[PDB]
Amino acid sequence: MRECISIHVGQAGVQIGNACWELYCLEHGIQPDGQMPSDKTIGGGDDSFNTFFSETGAGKHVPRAVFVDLEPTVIDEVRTGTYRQLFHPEQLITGKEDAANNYARGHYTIGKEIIDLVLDRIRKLADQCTGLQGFLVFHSFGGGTGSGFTSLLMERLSVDYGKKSKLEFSIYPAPQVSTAVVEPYNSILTTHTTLEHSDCAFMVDNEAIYDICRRNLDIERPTYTNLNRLISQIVSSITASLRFDGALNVDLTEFQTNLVPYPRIHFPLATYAPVISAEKAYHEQLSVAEITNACFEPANQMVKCDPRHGKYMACCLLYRGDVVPKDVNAAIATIKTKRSIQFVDWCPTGFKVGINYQPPTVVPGGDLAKVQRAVCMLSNTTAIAEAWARLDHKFDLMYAKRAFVHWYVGEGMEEGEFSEAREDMAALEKDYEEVGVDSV
Amino acid sequence: KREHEREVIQKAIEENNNFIKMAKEKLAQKMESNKENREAHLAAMLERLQEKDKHAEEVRKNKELKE
Amino acid sequence: MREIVHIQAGQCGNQIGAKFWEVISDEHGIDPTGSYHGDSDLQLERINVYYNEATGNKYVPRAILVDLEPGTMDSVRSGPFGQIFRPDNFVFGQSGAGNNWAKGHYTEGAELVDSVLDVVRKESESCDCLQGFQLTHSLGGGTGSGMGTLLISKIREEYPDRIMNTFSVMPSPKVSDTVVEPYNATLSVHQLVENTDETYCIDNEALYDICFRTLKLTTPTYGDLNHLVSATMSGVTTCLRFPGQLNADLRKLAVNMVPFPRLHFFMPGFAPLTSRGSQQYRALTVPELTQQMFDSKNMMAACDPRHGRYLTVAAIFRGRMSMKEVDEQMLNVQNKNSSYFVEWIPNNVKTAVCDIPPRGLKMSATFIGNSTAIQELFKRISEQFTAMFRRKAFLHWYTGEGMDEMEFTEAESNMNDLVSEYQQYQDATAD
Ligand SMILES: *[C@H]1[C@@H](C)[C@H]2[C@@H]([C@H](O)[C@H]3[C@H]4[C@H]([C@H](OC(C)=O)[C@H](OC(C)=O)[C@@]32C)[C@]2(C)[C@H](C[C@@H]3O[C@@H]3[C@@H]2OC(C)=O)C(=O)[C@@H]4O)[C@]2(C)[C@@]1(O)OC(=O)[C@@]2(C)O
Ligand SMILES: Nc1nc2c(ncn2[C@@H]2O[C@H](COP(=O)(O)OP(=O)(O)OP(=O)(O)O)[C@@H](O)[C@H]2O)c(=O)[nH]1
Ligand SMILES: Nc1nc2c(ncn2[C@@H]2O[C@H](COP(=O)(O)OP(=O)(O)OP(=O)(O)O)[C@@H](O)[C@H]2O)c(=O)[nH]1
Ligand SMILES: [Ca+2]
Ligand SMILES: [Mg+2]
Ligand SMILES: [Mg+2]
C-alpha cells in the first residue's frame, strides 16, 4: 500500500504527465499495452512500483492517475497516442471549452461544470487503494486551467480527504514559452488559494529548464518536448524513493520532515545532475563527487535564484544508480570546505542522503545521455523567494493600472480577491525574510 | 495521563474537522458570491441592449410622427 | 471543435469577405466545389473552425452573406468560390441604403435583421462549441456600417458570452468622395466601442498609401486594396486555423490583446510589402522582415506607432525559418524600441511561428498591435465629422429616418472619450 495518486491538470500538467509515465514504464519494464513480464504476481501485489501502478486481472499495469483539461485536444493525443492502452478511458477527462488563460474561468465559470465528475473519478482510484498516502498534482501557474481549476480541485480535495498529503509540481512562467500576458495574475491567485491546501510544492521555472536545454544539451530553441523530458527525469528522481525499494532508499516523506520547518515554508529548490549530451558523455565518467558538486552550481537549478546569497534550512541529496555511501561522504566533505553553504542558526547543518540503486533511464529519441549515476538535490533555501519577488513585481506593474482585470471581474471575481492574494504573497516574502534572521 | 492522552487526540480530531468545515464553507461562499457577480454583470449587459431596442422603437416612432 | 460564425455585410464586407474565403480555402486545400484536394493533415486539423462538413465529404464555409442591395448577391455567387457558399445563407433586401447609416441601423436594415438572425441561429445551433462571431464590413457606407452594427447588438443579445470580432474598413477621401462617410463612421465607432470585443482597423487611407507609395501603383483598384486586406486577414486568423500554442482562439486573443474593454481597436500590419521591381523577397532576412513589420509604412491603419505606445502586440511569422532567429530579432526590436512599449505591462509582445506560408511568399510576418497611436485614425475621422456637423450638412438624411441630432453629439463625444483614454494610458508610467 502507501499508494500515490497523480493528477495532471491543464496542458502543462498533462504533457508533463505523458513524459513522466512514459519514463516510469521504461524504468519498471512496463510495455505500452501495460504488460510487465517481470511481474509474477498477476492482478495485484504490494511491490514498490504498485504505489504508482494498479494491476488488472489481465496483467495490465495501470497508472494511478487522472488527466484533466477543460478542452479536449491535448488529452485527445493521449487517447490516440502510443500509451493509449495504458489508461482506462475514464482516467482521461475533458471538457469542450478551456479557461482562456483566465483563473476565474478555471476556478469558477468553466471549472465548476466538471469538478464533480473529476472528484468522482479520483474517488474511483482512491477506493482501489488499501493505504492511500496522498496526491501529486501537476499543473502550470500561468494557464487558466492550471491555475484556476487546480486551486478549485485542491480546495475540494482538502474537504473530501482531510489532511491527506498533497504535493505539487508547479510550472513557473518564463517569457521564452509563455502564452499569456496575465500569467502573473494567475500565478499569484493560485498560489494564494492553494497555499493552505498544499503540504509541499516543487516549482519548475520554465526559464531555468529552457536555459539548461540550451546550454547543457545544445538545443537551439527548446520545445515543450525538450523541456518535459528533462522535467520528467527530475520528477522521477523525486518519486523513485516511492517506486523502488532498497536498503539505503530514503522515502520522500522522510525528506519532507526536514524540508518543511513551517507549513507555509514548503517550497524546496530542486537541482539535478548530470544533464549532458551523448556527444559529450562519450568517454566521460561523471563521478559521485562531480555530480554532487554540480548540485551547488546555480545553473543546474530548477528555479532561477541564488542560494549563495540566501540561507539554507535543509539540504537533501537523492542519488540514483552506481553510488555507495563512502563516495557520497567524501564528496560532501569536500563541498563543506569550499562552497557557500550557510545555514540558518536554528537548524542542523547535516545533509540528508538517500540512495536508489536502479540506474537512470532515458527515453529513445531524447537529448539526455544515459549515465551510470545521477543526483537530485532538494534544498530549503530562502533564495527561492526570489521567484516570488519577480512574479509579484510583474503583478504590481499591471494591477496598479488594473490592466486585464475586467476579464476576471466579468467572470464574477472581485478586486478584493486580487489584493487579498497579493497581500498573502507579501506576507510569504516576509516569512522567508524572517526565517533567515538570526535568533536572539 | 490517560485523561491528557484522550484530550490530545480529541483536539487533533477537532482541529482537522474545523479545517475541513471552514474549507467547505469558504468555498461554498466563494462560488455563490461569484455566481451572483457574473449573473449581475450579464444582466446589466442585457439591460443595456434592451435600452437600445427601446431607443430604436422610439426612433422609428419618431419617423412616423414626422410624416 | 470551436466554431466561428462569419458574417459579411454590404458591398465592402462581401467583397473582402469573398476574398478571405478564397484565400483560406486555398490554404486549407478546399476547391470551389468544397472538396479537399490538399496533401497536409495540418490543413484539415482545425478545418471545422471555419467550415461545416456536408454530404460527400464537402466543406461549406460557416458564412452568412448580407446586403440591402440585391445585386451583390449575384456578384458573390458569380465570383470564384461563389458556388461554395450555402444557398440559404444569402440574405438580401431590395435596395441599398444609399450611404445612410440610419437606414441600415434603424429602418430598412432593421426590417431585414430578423431574417439574418434566423440564419445565424441555424448555423450556431449546429456548433459543437461556438466560440464567437466574425463580421466584415465598411463603416463608410450605410448597410455594412448601419446594419452591421445593428447585427452585432442583436447577436450580442442572444450570445452575450461569446466573442464578437470585426474587420472594419475605415473610410478615406483618397478612395471614396462620398461626403457623409464621416457621419457613418462615427456612428459606427459609437456602436463598436460598446458592443465588440475586438476590432481590426482596416484603413482605406493606409491601403491606398501602401499601393501608391510602396507598391508604386498609379491607380489602385478595390481588388488591389483587397489583396492587402485578404493577406492580412489570412495572417491574423492563422493562429485560429492551424494547430499552435499562441492565441489559438478568439477569447485567448482578446485576453492577451485587450487590457481595458473599450480599447480593443487594433492596428494590423503585414510584411513584406515590396514592389515587383527590386525585391520580391530575394533575401529579405528575418531581421529585415522584423524591422519592416514594425514600421509605419507596413501598417493597415494610417497611424505612426512611434507617435504612441504599444499596450499589447501579437506577431505571427509564417514559412520555413529559424525560430531561434525570430526569437532573437523580436527581443532586439523590443530592446531598441523599448520606449514604444508600455513599461507597466511586462512581456506584452507575443510571437507565433506557423510553418505554412501564404500563397506566393516563402516567408511573411503579420502584425497585430494595440497602440495608443490609433487615436490618429479616430482624430482624422473626428476632424472630418466636425467639418460636416458644424453646418449640419446632410443631417436631414438621418433625422428623416427619425434620428435626433443628440445621437450625433453622443457618438462624437464617445469617440472623443476613446481618444483621450488611449492618451491616458500613453502618458501613464510605472512610477
Ligand atoms: C492589382 C495588382 C496590383 C495585383 C494583382 C495580383 O493579384 C497581385 C499579386 C501581388 C502583387 O503585389 C505586387 C507585385 O506588388 C499585386 O498586388 C498588389 C500590388 O497589391 C498584384 C499584381 C503579389 C504578386 C502576390 C504574390 C506575392 O506576394 C507578392 C505580391 O503581393 C504583394 C503584397 O507584394 C500575388 O500573388 C498577387 O497575385 C491584381 C489582379 C490586380 O491586378 O487586381 C487585383 O484584384 C489583384 C490584386 O488580384
Ligand atoms: N514545461 C512545460 N510548460 C508548459 C507546457 N505546456 C504549457 N506550459 C506552460 O504553461 C503555461 C500556460 O498554461 P497551460 O497549461 O498551457 O494552460 P491550461 O492549463 O491548459 O489552461 P487554459 O488553456 O487557459 O485552459 C505557460 O507558461 C506555458 O509555458 C509543457 O508542456 N511543458
Ligand atoms: N477596401 C475596400 N473598401 C471598400 C470596398 N467596397 C466599398 N468600400 C468602401 O466602403 C465605403 C462604402 O461602403 P459600402 O460597403 O460600399 O456600402 P454598403 O455597406 O453596401 O452600404 P450601402 O451601399 O449604403 O447600402 C467606401 O468608403 C468605400 O471606399 C472594397 O471592396 N474594398
Ligand atoms: Ca503484481
Ligand atoms: Mg489549455
Ligand atoms: Mg451598397
Coordinates of N, CA and C in Angstrom, one line a residue, chain A residues 3-9 54 63-69 88-93 114-130 132-138 149-162 164-166:
Chain A
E3 N -0.2 3.9 -1.5 CA -0.4 4.3 -2.9 C -0.4 5.8 -3.1
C4 N 0.1 6.2 -4.3 CA 0.1 7.6 -4.6 C -0.7 7.9 -5.9
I5 N -1.6 8.8 -5.8 CA -2.5 9.2 -7.0 C -2.0 10.5 -7.6
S6 N -1.7 10.4 -8.9 CA -1.2 11.6 -9.7 C -2.4 12.3 -10.4
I7 N -2.4 13.6 -10.3 CA -3.5 14.3 -11.0 C -2.8 15.4 -11.9
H8 N -3.1 15.2 -13.2 CA -2.4 16.1 -14.2 C -3.5 17.1 -14.8
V9 N -3.2 18.4 -14.5 CA -4.2 19.4 -14.8 C -3.7 20.4 -15.9
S54 N -1.7 0.4 -10.4 CA -2.6 -0.7 -10.0 C -2.4 -1.8 -11.1
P63 N -1.5 3.2 -14.6 CA -1.2 4.4 -13.7 C -2.3 4.8 -12.8
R64 N -2.0 5.0 -11.5 CA -2.9 5.6 -10.6 C -2.9 7.1 -10.9
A65 N -3.6 7.5 -11.9 CA -3.5 8.8 -12.4 C -4.9 9.3 -13.1
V66 N -5.1 10.6 -12.9 CA -6.2 11.2 -13.6 C -5.7 12.4 -14.4
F67 N -6.1 12.5 -15.7 CA -5.7 13.6 -16.6 C -7.0 14.4 -16.8
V68 N -6.9 15.7 -16.5 CA -8.0 16.7 -16.6 C -7.6 17.9 -17.4
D69 N -8.4 18.3 -18.4 CA -8.3 19.5 -19.1 C -9.6 20.0 -19.5
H88 N -7.3 3.7 -18.6 CA -8.7 3.5 -18.8 C -9.3 4.8 -19.3
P89 N -10.3 4.7 -20.2 CA -10.9 5.9 -20.8 C -11.4 6.9 -19.7
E90 N -11.8 6.4 -18.6 CA -12.4 7.2 -17.5 C -11.3 8.0 -16.7
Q91 N -10.1 7.7 -16.9 CA -9.0 8.4 -16.3 C -8.6 9.7 -17.1
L92 N -9.1 9.7 -18.3 CA -8.8 10.9 -19.2 C -10.1 11.7 -19.4
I93 N -10.1 12.9 -18.7 CA -11.3 13.7 -18.6 C -11.1 15.0 -19.3
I114 N -17.3 20.7 -14.3 CA -16.6 19.4 -14.4 C -16.0 18.9 -13.1
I115 N -16.0 19.8 -12.1 CA -15.3 19.4 -10.8 C -15.9 18.2 -10.1
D116 N -17.2 18.0 -10.2 CA -17.8 16.9 -9.5 C -17.5 15.6 -10.2
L117 N -17.4 15.6 -11.5 CA -17.0 14.4 -12.3 C -15.6 14.0 -12.0
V118 N -14.7 15.0 -12.0 CA -13.3 14.8 -11.7 C -13.1 14.1 -10.3
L119 N -13.8 14.7 -9.3 CA -13.7 14.1 -8.0 C -14.3 12.7 -7.9
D120 N -15.3 12.4 -8.7 CA -15.9 11.1 -8.7 C -14.9 10.1 -9.3
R121 N -14.1 10.5 -10.3 CA -13.1 9.6 -11.0 C -11.9 9.4 -10.0
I122 N -11.6 10.5 -9.3 CA -10.5 10.4 -8.3 C -10.9 9.4 -7.2
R123 N -12.1 9.5 -6.7 CA -12.7 8.7 -5.7 C -12.6 7.2 -6.2
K124 N -12.9 7.0 -7.5 CA -12.8 5.6 -8.0 C -11.4 5.0 -7.9
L125 N -10.4 5.9 -8.0 CA -9.0 5.5 -7.9 C -8.7 5.3 -6.4
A126 N -9.1 6.2 -5.5 CA -8.9 6.1 -4.1 C -9.5 4.9 -3.5
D127 N -10.6 4.5 -3.9 CA -11.3 3.3 -3.4 C -10.6 2.0 -3.7
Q128 N -9.7 2.1 -4.7 CA -8.9 0.9 -5.1 C -7.6 0.8 -4.3
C129 N -7.3 1.8 -3.5 CA -6.1 1.8 -2.6 C -6.4 1.2 -1.3
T130 N -5.5 0.5 -0.7 CA -5.6 -0.1 0.6 C -4.9 0.7 1.7
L132 N -3.9 4.6 0.9 CA -3.5 5.8 0.2 C -2.7 6.8 1.0
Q133 N -1.5 7.2 0.4 CA -0.6 8.1 1.1 C -1.0 9.5 0.8
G134 N -1.3 9.8 -0.5 CA -1.7 11.2 -0.9 C -1.7 11.4 -2.4
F135 N -1.7 12.7 -2.8 CA -1.8 13.1 -4.2 C -0.6 13.8 -4.7
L136 N -0.2 13.7 -5.9 CA 0.7 14.5 -6.6 C 0.0 15.3 -7.7
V137 N 0.1 16.6 -7.7 CA -0.7 17.4 -8.6 C 0.2 18.2 -9.6
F138 N 0.1 18.0 -10.9 CA 0.9 18.6 -11.9 C 0.1 19.7 -12.6
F149 N -8.4 25.8 -12.1 CA -9.0 24.6 -11.8 C -8.3 23.8 -10.7
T150 N -6.9 23.9 -10.8 CA -6.1 23.2 -9.8 C -6.5 23.7 -8.4
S151 N -6.6 25.0 -8.2 CA -6.9 25.6 -6.9 C -8.3 25.1 -6.4
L152 N -9.2 25.1 -7.3 CA -10.5 24.6 -7.0 C -10.4 23.1 -6.6
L153 N -9.7 22.3 -7.3 CA -9.5 20.9 -7.0 C -8.8 20.7 -5.7
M154 N -7.8 21.5 -5.4 CA -7.1 21.4 -4.1 C -8.0 21.7 -2.9
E155 N -8.8 22.7 -3.1 CA -9.8 23.0 -2.0 C -10.7 21.9 -1.8
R156 N -11.3 21.3 -2.9 CA -12.2 20.2 -2.8 C -11.6 18.9 -2.2
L157 N -10.3 18.7 -2.6 CA -9.6 17.5 -2.1 C -9.4 17.6 -0.6
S158 N -9.1 18.8 -0.1 CA -8.9 19.0 1.4 C -10.2 18.7 2.1
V159 N -11.4 18.9 1.5 CA -12.7 18.7 2.1 C -12.9 17.2 2.1
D160 N -12.7 16.5 1.0 CA -13.0 15.1 0.8 C -12.0 14.1 1.3
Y161 N -10.8 14.6 1.5 CA -9.7 13.7 2.0 C -8.9 14.3 3.2
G162 N -9.4 15.4 3.8 CA -8.8 15.9 5.0 C -7.4 16.4 4.8
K164 N -4.9 14.5 4.2 CA -4.2 13.6 3.4 C -3.2 14.4 2.5
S165 N -2.0 13.9 2.4 CA -0.9 14.8 1.8 C -1.2 15.1 0.4
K166 N -0.9 16.3 0.0 CA -1.0 16.8 -1.4 C 0.3 17.5 -1.8

